[PDB]
Design a protein around this nucleic acid. Sequence first.
DNA 1: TTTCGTCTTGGGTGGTCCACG
DNA 2: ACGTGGACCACCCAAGACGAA
Length: 155
Amino acid sequence: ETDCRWDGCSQEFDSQEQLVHHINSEHIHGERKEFVCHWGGCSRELRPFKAQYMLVVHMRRHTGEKPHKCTFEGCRKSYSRLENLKTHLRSHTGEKPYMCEHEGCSKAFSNASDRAKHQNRTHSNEKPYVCKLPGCTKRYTDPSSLRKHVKTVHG
DNA sequence: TTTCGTCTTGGGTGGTCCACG
DNA sequence: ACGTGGACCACCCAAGACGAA
Ligand SMILES: [Co+2]
Ligand SMILES: [Co+2]
Ligand SMILES: [Co+2]
Ligand SMILES: [Co+2]
Ligand SMILES: [Co+2]
């Protein structure tokens, strides 16, 4: 939010455009000696990336930049991951390209991942969002059901 | 080369919604 | 006679891998 925080760099700024410009040119762009974020609190410190285009997407965490805009006139939602914008898209249509494929369900998602939750969870059997308050033994399929409990109940 | 493509896997929030205790 | 608990979903989004452009 308007100011590099790359280790040592001190450019404050005016527009996302510029900052998210400076990074790719200043820090991520050039060099032939390995790409790693060096941003303040980076949850990976220096867990280098494989390719360097991968770092580049990562910053969008740090930067805030969701550059894949939606097209459907009127709507103005970006994302910062292509995959995402793709799905955000279908919703404008109803496109559920992604059927629960396996064992014999026939239900489908606008996207792959939600198809994989449902997919594993809804045909679960186990419930691994077990609450961890002693004298409960309360477990659910999804973090949401859990979460609601450990706080409607405990907490 | 590197980057994409698209999938897999995985860490979240807000909620409907209704059935059964 | 019935309230809520919790299964299931919608959106959120990071990142591997591995091959294709
Ligand atoms: Co900088
Ligand atoms: Co970082
Ligand atoms: Co849109
Ligand atoms: Co299914
Ligand atoms: Co509990």
